[PDB]
Amino acid sequence: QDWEDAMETLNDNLKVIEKADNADQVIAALLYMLAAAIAAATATPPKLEDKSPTSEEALAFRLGMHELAALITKATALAYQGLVKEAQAAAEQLKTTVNAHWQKYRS
Amino acid sequence: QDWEDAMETLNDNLKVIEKADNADQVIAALLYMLAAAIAAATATPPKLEDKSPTSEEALAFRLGMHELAALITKATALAYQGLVKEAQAAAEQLKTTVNAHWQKYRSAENLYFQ
Amino acid sequence: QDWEDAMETLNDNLKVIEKADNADQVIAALLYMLAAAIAAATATPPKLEDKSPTSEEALAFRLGMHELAALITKATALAYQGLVKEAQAAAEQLKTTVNAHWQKYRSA
Ligand SMILES: [Ca+2]
Ligand SMILES: [Ca+2]
Ligand SMILES: [Ca+2]
Ligand SMILES: [Ca+2]
Ligand SMILES: [Cl-]
């Protein structure tokens, strides 16, 4: 999947998490988000199409995707413990961090 | 030897997944693969022994191992849902990707000058 | 968020694992450790404040954190199979790794 596909998967699974009723649906959605965040870190967003992958700018992009994976993993740990509303709050919060990355690198 | 060892762990656990009878057996094998994929991205394969770790070619290698981690994680999501046949099919697909990475970065010395 | 805050989360959750009685307690703590290791790889520790983020020294730091995430994930696989004592022994090994990394990268 290209970068925009991975971002769509993040968007689609955030919507699943906010409507979820039990931990298993929240964890499954977070695992799909984690896979997408890892994939996004290996892809090239539009704003970086012609940049050297070892540039400071490309590294900052990949680190930003790694930050998303950290937050997704923390929300997975909350949900694993049965703290489903807490994991849902964490997902709502990391929606804004995902959005920051999306807006920075899209188009 | 670290990269070759990780690749062996990937191949070993793909066989576990093919023989698995339930979701928990598949998930455990995928978690071992994910650990080996992450470890492999910190290793230097034979093809890159002489290159700067900050070179483009070394980064491309690391991102290729991260691609494998993403496929493994997706298979793990399928197995967590109970979609065992689907996770097994995803694993058969990532075997092809593991093979491609292995052929790209392994030592080619047996093939020199053929 | 601090590199130091991620190191504290790793330290805290190693104590949780050492006192655990069952696999789910170990798995939850390992997942918090995995989140912290990933987060730490995106931070700049004091030792690296004077270096380019694209330097070999910064890359070695990030790969040391990735190495820690691999060990954490392997301990999670052990605990997922019910091998609680094995997972706790793996955690004792990564205590050493976390300590070494802390000592290396703290202080400018
Ligand atoms: Ca597409
Ligand atoms: Ca069988
Ligand atoms: Ca503190
Ligand atoms: Ca403290
Ligand atoms: Cl076999």
Q: In angstroms, rounded to a whole number, what is the distance separating the alpha carbons of residues A29 and B81? A: 10
Q: Between chains, do C31 and A63 touch, taking CB under 8 Å as contact?
A: no
Q: Is the torsion defined by CA of B69, B71, B74, B79 positive or negative? A: negative
- How many angstroms separate the alpha carbon of residue B28 from the centre of ligand 5? 16
Contact B13, B100 (CB under 8 A): no
Q: Which residue has the tokens 């709502």?
A: A92
Q: Which residue has the tokens 């400018």?
A: C108
- Report the residue from A59, A76, A80 with minimal CB separation from C53: A59
Q: In angstroms, rounded to a whole number, what is the distance separating the alpha carbons of residues C60 and C47? A: 12
Q: In angstroms, rounded to a whole number, what is the distance separating the alpha carbons of residues B36 and A77? A: 21
Q: Between chains, do A38 and B80 touch, taking CB under 8 Å as contact?
A: no
> How near does any CA of chain A get to the CA of C107, in Å?
23
Asked how this structure was determined, the answer is: X-ray
Q: In angstroms, rounded to a whole number, what is the distance separating the alpha carbons of residues B95 and B4? A: 15
Nearest residue on chain A to C76, alpha-carbon basis:
A77
Contact B46, B106 (CB under 8 A): yes
Contact C101, C65 (CB under 8 A): yes
How many Å is the maximal CA-CA distance in chain C?
Answer: 45
Resolution of the PDB structure in angstroms: 1.5
Here the tokens at position B30 are 């995928």
Q: Between chains, do C59 and B52 touch, taking CB under 8 Å as contact?
A: no
3-state secondary structure C13-81: HHHHHHCCCCHHHHHHHHHHHHHHHHHHHCCCCHHHCCCCCCCHHHHHHHHHHHHHHHHHHHHHHHHHC
AA identity, residue C42: T
> How near does any CA of chain A get to the CA of C35, in Å?
4
Q: In angstroms, rounded to a whole number, what is the distance separating the alpha carbons of residues A6 and C63? A: 24
> How near does any CA of chain C get to the CA of A34, in Å?
11
Chains that touch A (3 or more CB pairs under 8 A): B, C
**Would you call B100 an interface residue with chain A, using a CB distance cutoff of 8 Å?**
no
- How many angstroms separate the alpha carbon of residue B91 from the centre of ligand 1? 22
